[PDB]
Amino acid sequence: KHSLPDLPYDYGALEPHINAQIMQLHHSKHHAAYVNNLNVTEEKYQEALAKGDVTAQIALQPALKLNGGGHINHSIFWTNLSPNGGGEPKGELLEAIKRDFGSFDKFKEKLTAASVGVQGSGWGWLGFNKERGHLQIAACPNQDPLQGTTGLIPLLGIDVWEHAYYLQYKNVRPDYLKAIWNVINWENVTERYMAC
Amino acid sequence: KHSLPDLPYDYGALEPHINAQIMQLHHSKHHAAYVNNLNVTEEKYQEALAKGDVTAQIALQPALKLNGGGHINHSIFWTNLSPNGGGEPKGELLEAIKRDFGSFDKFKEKLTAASVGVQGSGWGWLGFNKERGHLQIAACPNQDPLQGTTGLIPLLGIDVWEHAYYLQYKNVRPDYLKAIWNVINWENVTERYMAC
Amino acid sequence: KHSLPDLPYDYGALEPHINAQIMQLHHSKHHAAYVNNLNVTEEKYQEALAKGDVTAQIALQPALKLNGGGHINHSIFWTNLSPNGGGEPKGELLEAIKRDFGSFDKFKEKLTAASVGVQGSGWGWLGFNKERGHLQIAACPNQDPLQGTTGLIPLLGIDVWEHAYYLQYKNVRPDYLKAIWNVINWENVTERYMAC
Amino acid sequence: KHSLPDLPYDYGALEPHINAQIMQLHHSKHHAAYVNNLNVTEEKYQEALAKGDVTAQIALQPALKLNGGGHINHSIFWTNLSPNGGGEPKGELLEAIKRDFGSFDKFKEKLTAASVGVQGSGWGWLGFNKERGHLQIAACPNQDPLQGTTGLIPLLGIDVWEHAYYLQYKNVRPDYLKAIWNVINWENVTERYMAC
Ligand SMILES: [Mn+2]
Ligand SMILES: [Mn+2]
Ligand SMILES: [Mn+2]
Ligand SMILES: [Mn+2]
């Protein structure tokens, strides 16, 4: 039922910021596995739910969150990147950012600190808080998705699982984050922002 | 779809060990709420699953675990108690206990320590480990059910949420546990044991 | 080293909103135990730290958080209540509240929903976010303290562990929260607010 | 106060099972950082403890567990590996394994499944349960150390953080685990076993 989305660009389109090998493995191996495991899990769940098996439903939660979240997180991630990205955003998004973070650079600073501070595997996110009407930074462990676990609407996500950058930046997570700013697709972040 | 099971005895049948007021509130108020909230949650979940909404499925996990677990835990609990309970078990169960804990009294000791040691709300459990083929003691937080979260088959559960004993024993959890041994339905624990 | 603070009022001073029995048990039994267990734990920790025993330091974390948090949370709680409290706050605090929540009543609404929504044992909090410079509502499980786990400065806390209200309101948590508004010490919340 | 232990062998001594690049990065970069961050954290903690600052003590727990656990876990890991390892264990350890797992191969199977099943970052462990007197398999998230969080005495640990194997086995965690069996230092696991 769920499927692996095609990448809107070639695997080597983000060089030299993120090399082709990482993109190929990240998409065709990591994301593909999450989609496949998600469909298997949803199927078992449909089954447990049909016969009112509460125990089975609860036992399947970790697998559904990990794989379901994995699919959601990476799907957004691909659209957040672009060989034509980089620079700074414009319009209302830029204003919202100055408003809520003081300046674009302070925002970069914050999101970078949150991403680098993730203990173990996880994601750094720029999300929108519907209740307050402000932008908000949050970090999620493993594949826990932003909206499903915090209620925030995801605008921009940064994957900090080691498979995201190890082949190229090894243990230096800060180098990875410094480079990713050059390929952020602000046009996509902007429309996600305008949508909510 | 799920329903509140009738108690196999009168509300005051466990006096003076657990008074009638607690039993009445615990069953007709606490357990009833879990069953009702469970049906509402499973329904929303059926809905999220039908349209492949992964985000909604993940957001509903806490409510399904709390209410689904609440229903499962209390349902077992009622059958674990009896106005004719108390004393010690006999047969294979008693042997399994001596085998795995040394003696019946050391077992009581262990399970009591685990129950009293729960930080906040939770349950103390005597469960069966299918893999090892031995009895095992475990404690679960809030309403997290034994089997669904640990894989152990539940044999005997002791509810240590404060609503379990506060009206009668106030803050003295140890007095509550000392009294509950007088109403344990060993015949029920035995058949749960024989079943697995 | 740490000690049980005296209550700034008589045990029955909050009647009929919170009866004397609850206040007496809550202070002399529950809080006293947390203080005593905290001193024992800090002592063991001083010891583990002296000989560089990392394993022991990590094993003691749950007990230090539960008891240390228990002491911190209840200490603030006593000052948040007053036989002369109730009504609405005035000055800058009232403005900060209208600003961040729309109105005082919407604020009450929010904090009440957060408190009632705590699964199991926990606290509902009105805190101050130093980074953003705005008021913020948060809920913490068990005795996890607000500042130590979220960074927010605590202004007003509402204890929703069942021992907080069970003797008087039984399972009806909403009745408990409706009554507590009549004894909130706004003068204390205000000065905590002015301090940060 | 704490220090980076020297490796008991050359960085390329485990080839071709684990290449030299991984060993060099894993030891001189990853482990070194944990030791350095641990000393900084213990120092801040000594300070918080001296002035009875409970809030600061609690805020430092995540950093102490991650770095303290990181140091403990990797220190054991280095001794668990050897260019002269591989094969099967002998003596009492082998008997304990047959006893508790049926056979050596079923044990390998179990530990492999536990290691591969870790969601995100973590470790698979073969530990000793002092209470029961049996061997036990457990998995821990991130750098949470075995003994400090479960009470089990660590005998053999397998690091499944992606930095452990990504450069060489990429996303195929099962290939990594199949290869690591060839360098397990059973003589070290045996003496850890005899010690407890
Ligand atoms: Mn990824
Ligand atoms: Mn209950
Ligand atoms: Mn309390
Ligand atoms: Mn490692």
- As a whole number of angstroms, the distance between CA A184 and CA D155 comes to 46
Taking the CA of residue D167 and the nearest CA in chain C, the distance in Å comes to: 31
The closest of C168, C142, C26, C24 to B167, measured between CA atoms, is C168
Measured N-to-C along each axis, helices D92-101 and D104-116 cross at an angle, to the nearest 10 degrees, of 70
CB contact under 8 A, D55 and C148: yes
CB contact under 8 A, D62 and A119: yes
Residues facing B141 on adjacent strands: B122
Taking the CA of residue B94 and the nearest CA in chain C, the distance in Å comes to: 33
Cis amide linkage into residue B16, ω under 30° from 0? yes
| Chain C residue at shortest CA distance from B168 | C167
Query: What are the DSSP E strand ranges found in C58-159?
Result: 122-129, 134-141, 153-159
* Residues of chain A neighbouring D141 (CB-CB closer than 8 A): 120
Please provide the DSSP assignment of chain A as one string: ---PPPPSS-TTTTTTTS-HHHHHHIIIIIIHHHHHHHHHHHHHHHHHHHTT-HHHHHHTHHHHHHHHHHHHHHHHHHHHB-TT--S---THHHHHHHHHHSSHHHHHHHHHHHHHT--SSEEEEEEEETTTTEEEEEEEETT--HHHHH-PEEEEEEE-SGGGTHHHHTT-HHHHHHHHGGGB-HHHHHHHHHH-
Cβ proximity of D150 and D124 under 8 Å: no
CB contact under 8 A, B162 and C167: no
Structural Rg of chain C based on CA atoms = 17
> Quick count: other Cβ atoms within 10 Å of Cβ C1?
10
Q: How far apart are the first and last CA of chain D?
A: 27
- List strands edge to edge, sheet with D153-159: D134-141, D122-129, D153-159
Taking the CA of residue D70 and the nearest CA in chain A, the distance in Å comes to: 11
DSSP state of C181: G
Q: How far apart are the first and last CA of chain C?
A: 27
For the record, the structure tokens of A18 come out as 């993120």
A114: Cβ contacts below 8 Å, ≥ 6 apart: A124, A125, A137, A138, A139
DSSP state of C182: G
Cβ proximity of D35 and D71 under 8 Å: yes
- As a whole number of angstroms, the distance between CA C31 and CA C1 comes to 15
- As a whole number of angstroms, the distance between CA B54 and CA B77 comes to 33
Q: Which residues of C touch D (CB under 8 A)?
A: 1-2, 38, 42, 45-46, 49, 52, 54-59, 61, 64-65, 68-69, 71-72, 145, 147-149, 151
Q: How many residues does chain B have?
A: 196
Distance of CA B37 to the CA centre of its chain: 18
| Chain C residue at shortest CA distance from D53 | C68
DSSP state of B143: T
For the record, the structure tokens of C191 come out as 């000065």
- As a whole number of angstroms, the distance between CA B43 and CA B40 comes to 5
- List strands edge to edge, sheet with B122-129: B134-141, B122-129, B153-159
| Chain C residue at shortest CA distance from B32 | C171
Q: Which CATH architecture has domain A19-82?
A: Orthogonal Bundle (1.10)
3-state secondary structure chain D: CCCCCCCCCCCCCCCCCCCHHHHHHHHHHHHHHHHHHHHHHHHHHHHHHHCCCHHHHHHCHHHHHHHHHHHHHHHHHHHHECCCCCCCCCCHHHHHHHHHHCCHHHHHHHHHHHHHCCCCCEEEEEEEECCCCEEEEEEEECCCCHHHHHCCEEEEEEECCHHHCHHHHCCCHHHHHHHHHHHECHHHHHHHHHHC
Distance of CA C86 to the CA centre of its chain: 17
**C123 backbone dihedrals φ, ψ, rounded to 5°:** -135, 150
The closest of B19, B1, B59 to B183, measured between CA atoms, is B19
Neighbouring C-alpha atoms within 13 Å toward the C-beta of A37: 19
- As a whole number of angstroms, the distance between CA C172 and CA A144 comes to 33
H/E stretch holding C196 reads none
Instruction: Specify burial of residue C36 (Cβ count, 10 A radius: 0-12, 13-18, 19+).
Output: middle
Cβ proximity of D109 and D120 under 8 Å: no
The closest of D134, C32, D17 to B136, measured between CA atoms, is D134
C67: Cβ contacts below 8 Å, ≥ 6 apart: C34, C35, C37, C38, C41, C143
For the record, the structure tokens of A108 come out as 């970069």
CA trace torsion C174, C177, C178, C183 (10° rounding): 160
**Residue B134 labeled ligand binder:** no
Please provide the DSSP assignment of C11-68 as one string: TTTTTTTS-HHHHHHIIIIIIHHHHHHHHHHHHHHHHHHHTT-HHHHHHTHHHHHHHH
Instruction: Specify burial of residue B12 (Cβ count, 10 A radius: 0-12, 13-18, 19+).
Output: middle
**Residue A74 labeled ligand binder:** yes
Cβ proximity of D38 and C54 under 8 Å: yes
Cβ proximity of C1 and C21 under 8 Å: no
Cβ proximity of A141 and A121 under 8 Å: yes
The closest of D32, D123, D17 to D73, measured between CA atoms, is D123
For residue A30, the CA-to-ligand 1 centroid distance in Å is 7
Which amino acid, one-letter code, is at C51? K
Instruction: Specify burial of residue B56 (Cβ count, 10 A radius: 0-12, 13-18, 19+).
Output: middle
The closest of A139, A151, A137 to A97, measured between CA atoms, is A137
Of the candidates D66, D122, D162, the beta carbon closest to that of A162 is on: D162
Distance of CA A76 to the CA centre of its chain: 6
CB contact under 8 A, B52 and A145: no
**CA-to-CA dists, residue C174 to B26, B32, C122, C124, C170, angstroms:** 17, 17, 15, 13, 10
For the record, the structure tokens of A103 come out as 């300046």
Of the candidates D29, D33, D167, the beta carbon closest to that of A167 is on: D167
For the record, the structure tokens of D129 come out as 């349960």
Q: Is the dihedral of CA D165, D169, D175, D179 positive or negative?
A: negative
Q: How many residues does chain A have?
A: 196
The neighbours of chain D, by the rule of 3 or more Cβ pairs under 8 Å, are A, C
Structural Rg of chain A based on CA atoms = 17
Task: Output the CA angle B88-B91-B96, nearest 5 degrees.
Answer: 85
**Residue B2 labeled ligand binder:** no
Cβ proximity of A194 and A94 under 8 Å: no
H/E stretch holding B155 reads strand B153-159
CATH no. for C83-196: 3.55.40.20
- As a whole number of angstroms, the distance between CA A135 and CA A155 comes to 9
Q: Where are the domains of chain B?
A: 19-82, 83-196
The closest of A57, A77, A60 to A7, measured between CA atoms, is A77
For residue A177, the CA-to-ligand 1 centroid distance in Å is 14
Residues facing A138 on adjacent strands: A125
The closest of B30, B56, B27, B29 to B44, measured between CA atoms, is B56
Measured N-to-C along each axis, helices C104-116 and C92-101 cross at an angle, to the nearest 10 degrees, of 70
- As a whole number of angstroms, the distance between CA D33 and CA D56 comes to 22
For the record, the structure tokens of D13 come out as 């001594």
What SS3 class is residue B127? strand
CB contact under 8 A, C55 and D72: yes
What SS3 class is residue B183? helix
The neighbours of chain A, by the rule of 3 or more Cβ pairs under 8 Å, are B, D
**D55 backbone dihedrals φ, ψ, rounded to 5°:** -60, -45
For the record, the structure tokens of A42 come out as 């949803």
Cβ proximity of D185 and D93 under 8 Å: no
| Chain C residue at shortest CA distance from B26 | C171
CB contact under 8 A, C142 and B161: no
DSSP state of B154: E
**CA-to-CA dists, residue A65 to A90, A173, B54, angstroms:** 34, 25, 8
Q: Residues of C87-120 as b/e, b for ≥16 C-beta within 10 angstroms?
A: eebeeebbebbeebbeeeeebbebbbebbeebbb
D28: Cβ contacts below 8 Å, ≥ 6 apart: none
Cβ proximity of A147 and A153 under 8 Å: yes
For the record, the structure tokens of B99 come out as 């085998």
* Residues of chain B neighbouring A144 (CB-CB closer than 8 A): 58
Q: Which residues of A touch B (CB under 8 A)?
A: 1-2, 38, 42, 45-46, 49, 52, 54-59, 61, 64-65, 68-69, 71-72, 144-145, 147-149, 151
For residue D190, the CA-to-ligand 2 centroid distance in Å is 46
Q: How many residues does chain D have?
A: 196
CB contact under 8 A, D65 and C64: no
The structure was resolved to a resolution in Å of: 2.3
Q: How many residues does chain C have?
A: 196
Q: Is the dihedral of CA D16, D18, D19, D23 positive or negative?
A: negative
**Block residue for tokens 């609405």:** C88
- As a whole number of angstroms, the distance between CA B165 and CA B44 comes to 33
What SS3 class is residue C134? strand
- As a whole number of angstroms, the distance between CA B21 and CA D43 comes to 53
DSSP state of B8: S
- As a whole number of angstroms, the distance between CA C186 and CA C93 comes to 9
Of the candidates C1, C54, C68, the beta carbon closest to that of D57 is on: C68
Ligand that lies nearest to the alpha carbon of residue D29, given by its number in the listed order: 4
- As a whole number of angstroms, the distance between CA D48 and CA D114 comes to 38
Distance of CA C160 to the CA centre of its chain: 9
β-pairing, B122-129 vs C122-129, is: unpaired
Cβ proximity of D186 and D87 under 8 Å: yes
Of the candidates C2, C57, C151, the beta carbon closest to that of D64 is on: C57
- As a whole number of angstroms, the distance between CA C168 and CA C172 comes to 9
**CA-to-CA dists, residue C190 to A147, B93, B102, C6, C53, angstroms:** 34, 61, 59, 21, 43
Of the candidates D49, D55, D148, the beta carbon closest to that of C145 is on: D55
- As a whole number of angstroms, the distance between CA A175 and CA A179 comes to 6
For the record, the structure tokens of D75 come out as 């220190």
What SS3 class is residue B129? strand
Cβ proximity of B64 and B24 under 8 Å: no
CA trace torsion B132, B133, B134, B136 (10° rounding): 70
Taking the CA of residue D13 and the nearest CA in chain A, the distance in Å comes to: 21
CB contact under 8 A, B55 and A147: yes
For residue D47, the CA-to-ligand 3 centroid distance in Å is 29
**CA-to-CA dists, residue B40 to B31, B36, B43, B44, angstroms:** 15, 6, 5, 6
Q: Which residues of B touch C (CB under 8 A)?
A: 25, 29-30, 33, 62, 66, 119-122, 141-143, 161-163, 166-167, 170-171
Among left, alpha and beta (phi > 0; psi -120 to 50; other), residue A140 is beta
Q: Which residues of C touch B (CB under 8 A)?
A: 25, 29-30, 33, 62, 66, 119-122, 141-143, 161-163, 166-167, 170-171
